Structures are given as structure tokens and as C-alpha cells.
Amino acid sequence: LIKGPWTKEEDQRVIELVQKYGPKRWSVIAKHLKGRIGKQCRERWHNHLNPE
Numbered sequence: 146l147i148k149g150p151w152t153k154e155e156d157q158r159v160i161e162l163v164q165k166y167g168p169k170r171w172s173v174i175a176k177h178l179k180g181r182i183g184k185q186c187r188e189r190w191h192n193h194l195n196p197e
Contacts, residue, residue, distance in 0.1 A: 156189065171184075
């Protein structure tokens with residue numbers, strides 16, 4: 146199933162990618178986040194990691 150807990154570095158990637166491409170497009174972000182699927186990438190953001 147899902148790997149170990151989210152890391153600051155892992156989150157850093159999502160933050161950058163979301164700033165680059167923009168919100169949504171979790172399919173694209175997931176392809177970079179080789180560890181978390183679109184669902185997890187979406188959750189991580191639509192929970193606590195929501196600066197923007």
C-alpha cells in the first residue's frame with residue numbers, strides 16, 4: 146500500500162510542482178512523486194499542506 150509517512154523533501158516536491166503547473170493535475174505530480182499516487186498527493190495538499 147502507501148509507503149512510509151510523508152517527508153519534508155517529499156512535500157517540497159509537491160509544493161514546487163503545484164507552484165510550477167498549478168493546483169490539480171495530480172496525475173502529473175504523481176508521476177514525479179514516485180512513492181505517492183494521485184490520491185495521496187491530492188490528500189496531502191487538501192488537508193494540511195495547503196499554503197496556497
